Paper text:
Olfactomedins (OLFs), modular proteins containing an [name] domain that are predominantly expressed in neural tissues, are involved in fundamental processes of cell growth, cell signaling and cell adhesion. To survey the [name] triads for calcium binding and to test whether calcium binding can be reverted by simultaneously altering Asn428 to an acidic Asp or Glu, we replaced the triad Asp–Asn–Asp with Asp–Glu–Ser, Asp–Asp–His and Asp–Glu–Lys via site-directed mutagenesis of Asn428 and Asp478.
For [name]-OLFN428E/[name] the difference upon the addition of calcium is within the error of DSF (±2°C), suggesting that [name]-OLFN428E/[name] cannot bind calcium; for [name]-OLFN428D/D478H a marginal stabilization was observed with calcium, suggesting weak if any calcium binding. Instead of not being visible ([name]-OLFD478S), or adopting a well ordered and helical loop at the top face (wild type), residues 260–265 are shifted ∼10 Å from the original top-face helical loop and are now in the approximate location of the [name]-OLFWT side helix. In turn, the residues previously forming the side helix (303–310) form an extended loop conformation. In addition, Lys478 is within hydrogen-bonding distance of the main-chain carbonyls of Gly326 and Leu381, and Asp380 forms a new hydrogen-bonding interaction with Tyr371 (2.7 Å). Like Asn428 in [name]-OLFD478S, Glu428 is no longer in the central cavity and instead forms hydrogen bonds to water molecules present in a cavity between blades D and E. In [name]-OLFWT this cavity is largely hydrophobic, and is lined with Trp373, Val439, Phe467 and Ile477. Overall, [name] domains harboring the Asp–Glu–Lys triad do not appear to be capable of metal-ion binding in the central pore.
Author numbering: 245 to 503
The structure:
């Protein structure tokens, strides 16, 4: 679980789109929990205002291969498609709010709701590609996180580790990078990494903040994005890959860590 040293070229995901026909924003659980398995996937369709539908699929279904097994109707709409599934629950930001909601998928139950203290929302502290990217939920090898900013932090990235059961903020770190200066961010092995553009063609993983030590540094790892679409990239620690949505396709990026 060392420092990132390389990011691969983006590879189009064809699996879920092939079996289902939907390009959709796809999510997988890095801690699959019975009765779900590694073949289970969830899609948020990105069409419409105040989206509440999450579609659940078994891609090796013995009953209805190709069609959703279940459609969940969330009790609050999504602020953005940047939700995560972790340990059997969907964690999402409620529209027009700084609230994170834990929705248990197999029981359709809200198990926790938490206001992220002081967090900006709805266009106050977006990433550099704009949109409602103020609050970014992330999963890594140690569980669930949230990436945000606050007025007191003057727009610098704040990072909190979340208790997945009750959404308490178990530890917080105020980092030394402005959120609006980077295009997206993700956590790998307890290090926050950010992506920046530095010309019209060229982007890099440009910064690292290690939550274990507090130490940060500039990086220059090439990051080959196809587009500049306001979204959140999500690390999947089970697959050890980054998953991104660009409005056309889901793509994965392979990673290498120093050994």
């Amino acid at each position: 679980c060392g420092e990132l040293v390389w990011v691969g070229e983006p590879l189009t995901l064809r699996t879920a789109e092939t079996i289902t026909g939907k390009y959709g924003v796809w999510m997988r659980d890095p801690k699959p929990t019975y009765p779900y398995t590694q073949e289970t996937t969830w899609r948020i369709d990105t069409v419409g205002t105040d989206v509440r539908q999450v579609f659940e699929y078994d891609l090796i279904s013995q009953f209805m291969q190709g069609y959703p097994s279940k459609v969940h109707i969330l009790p609050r709409p999504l602020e953005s498609t940047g939700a995560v599934v972790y340990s059997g629950s969907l964690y999402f930001q409620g529209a027009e709010s700084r609230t994170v909601i834990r929705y248990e998928l197999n029981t359709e139950t809200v198990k926790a709701e938490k206001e992220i203290p002081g967090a900006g929302y709805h266009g106050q502290f977006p990433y550099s590609w704009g949109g409602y990217t103020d609050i970014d939920l992330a999963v890594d090898e140690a569980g669930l996180w949230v990436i945000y900013s606050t007025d007191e932090a003057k727009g610098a990235i704040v990072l909190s580790k979340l208790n997945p059961e009750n959404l308490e903020l178990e530890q917080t770190w105020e980092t030394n990078i402005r959120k609006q200066s980077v295009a997206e961010a993700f956590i790998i092995c307890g290090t926050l990494y950010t992506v920046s553009s530095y010309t019209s063609a060229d982007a890099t993983v440009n910064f690292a903040y290690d939550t274990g030590t507090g130490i940060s540094k500039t990086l220059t790892i090439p990051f080959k994005n196809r587009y500049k679409y306001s979204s959140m990239i999500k690390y999947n620690p089970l697959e050890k890959k980054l998953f991104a949505w660009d409005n056309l396709n889901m793509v994965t990026y392979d990673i290498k860590l120093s050994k």
